[PDB]
Ligand binder design. Structure first.
Ligand code: GDP
Ligand code: BEF
Ligand code: MG
Lengths: 177, 281
């Protein structure tokens, strides 16, 4: 039984670590196998925030344009959407702008967003400055976070805070007209 | 009032779709649980392979770097286990790009072509490659939708077992329209037409080969072990002493670890073969 049922969606360029992120959250495991997601997948994990029990229904999407038609059809029905980039991949960060566009286009007007830079454990190759990124996120009233799916760094937090921002919006919507 | 989708009034992906399209063309009642997606994966993969053979035979792709050669921004770096080699045959890239893994129902990564191909698509919308992508992508999709549907149902998500299922069917139609467009194009005539050196790459001259770096060369050697018998191309690469430092270096980088095609076994073999060929050049 649960108090809340939130539906989340992960999006971002191919190979940035979406699936690796979701697996870490749901199964606490990490595989190094080079597998690429077809279309969409989903895992489920129940958390409790503020004494309230929240069910998370999380869907992974495929980053390749050749799958967009299939993935896009999953936006509108989402409470929150985590956009992911690779801190070692400059182009994936530059694509975040376009990814945010796809949200305005398929997603509900008042859907919760969240910016994530993954692979933070790769200190040597990191190429996207955190600072530069918190700015952009701030410029949009969006939360930000750097995760490593390999290590569990900030992973549980990312999903936790997307969950938190939803309960907050869910609550304001019940309150005001 | 069970309706799981029925397997054999077809044993080939294209027809087996429409025994299914057929009866989703024909309602209320559904255990997807009994459905053989895995068998569906076995068929689709043949569909892909057979469609690839056909393309290479009809000369449909028309040095001879391949179609995607001018769009490589990889800097010769290895992208998730694969480096870009401009001498891959288009029909192998095809295969690598759309064949579904039976153990995960996802794709094995062929990352170095993921971007150059998209770019190529954006610049040749009328191309055959696109029409083929459109088709095989829908094949991947159908597969996926079935996977989802099974577990959605299996999990509850009445919303899920429903809204997809509308779509699963809807994909069937666009497939057909695809089969139709592709078909007409392969009906076209073609003059006759092979490379003794490799099953996978176009011919590579001495000059071209030496300009490859360790990741590119390693990638080629790993690709050649997909053939049941040692290939001339790999003997050429492994028998050259000047290449080895950078091939082994790339192996040690750890970049190929995640591959699904037993890189450990392949690499162990390659090192053995090189040891052998190092004697008597
Ligand atoms: N070092 C490191 N590598 C990662 C991390 N996350 C993902 N990767 C690598 O990136 C690849 C792609 O991850 P994946 O989840 O499959 O990407 P996506 O599902 O297409 O978004 C993985 O196979 C890993 O090799 C991470 O946190 N640290
Ligand atoms: F490469 Be992942 F499926 F976006
Ligand atoms: Mg994925």
């Amino acid at each position: 039984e649960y108090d809340y049922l939130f539906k989340l969606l992960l999006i971002g360029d191919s190979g940035v670590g979406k699936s690796c992120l979701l697996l870490r959250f749901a199964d606490d495991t990490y595989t190094e196998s080079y597998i690429s997601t077809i279309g969409v997948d989903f895992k489920i994990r129940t958390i409790e925030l503020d004494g309230k029990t929240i069910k998370l229904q999380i869907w992974d999407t495929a980053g390749q344009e050749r799958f967009r038609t299939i993935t896009s059809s999953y936006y509108r029905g989402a409470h929150g959407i985590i956009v992911v980039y690779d801190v070692t991949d400059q182009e994936s960060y530059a694509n975040v702008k376009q990814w945010l566009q796809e949200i305005d286009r398929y997603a509900s007007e008042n859907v919760n967003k969240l910016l994530v830079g993954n692979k933070s454990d790769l200190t040597t190759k990191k190429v996207v400055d955190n600072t530069t990124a918190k700015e952009f996120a701030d410029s949009l009233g969006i939360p930000f976070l750097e995760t490593s799916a390999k290590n569990a760094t900030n992973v549980e937090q990312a999903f936790m805070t997307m969950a938190a921002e939803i309960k907050k919006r869910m609550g304001l919507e019940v309150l005001f007209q | 009032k069970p309706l799981t989708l029925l397997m054999t009034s077809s044993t080939s992906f294209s027809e087996t779709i429409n025994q299914w399209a057929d009866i989703l063309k024909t309602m209320e009642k559904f255990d997807s649980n009994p459905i053989n997606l895995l068998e569906l994966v076995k068929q689709f993969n043949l569909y892909v392979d057979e469609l690839a053979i056909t393309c290479e035979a009809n000369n449909v792709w028309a040095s001879t770097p391949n179609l995607f050669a001018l769009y490589d921004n990889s800097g010769g770096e290895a992208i998730h286990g694969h480096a870009f080699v401009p001498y891959y045959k288009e029909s192998i890239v095809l295969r690598r790009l759309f064949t579904v893994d039976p153990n995960t129902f996802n794709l094995s990564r062929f990352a170095a072509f993921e971007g150059p191909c998209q770019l190529y698509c954006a610049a040749h919308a009328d191309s055959a490659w696109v029409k083929i992508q459109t088709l095989l992508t829908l094949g991947n999709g159908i597969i996926n939708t079935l996977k989802i549907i099974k577990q959605a149902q299996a999990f509850g998500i009445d919303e899920a077992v429903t809204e997809n299922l509308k779509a699963l069917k809807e994909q069937f139609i666009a497939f057909q329209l695809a089969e139709a467009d592709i078909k007409e194009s392969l009906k076209a005539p073609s003059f006759a037409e092979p490379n003794k050196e490799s099953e996978f790459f176009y011919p590579i001259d001495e000059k071209a080969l030496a300009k490859m770096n360790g990741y590119q060369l390693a990638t080629i050697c790993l690709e050649e072990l997909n053939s049941p018998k040692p290939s001339p191309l790999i003997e050429r690469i492994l028998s050259n002493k000047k290449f080895w430092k950078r091939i082994n270096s790339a192996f040690e980088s750890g970049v190929f670890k995640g591959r699904t095609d037993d890189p450990a076994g392949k690499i162990a073999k390659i090192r053995e073969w090189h040891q052998l060929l190092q004697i008597s050049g």
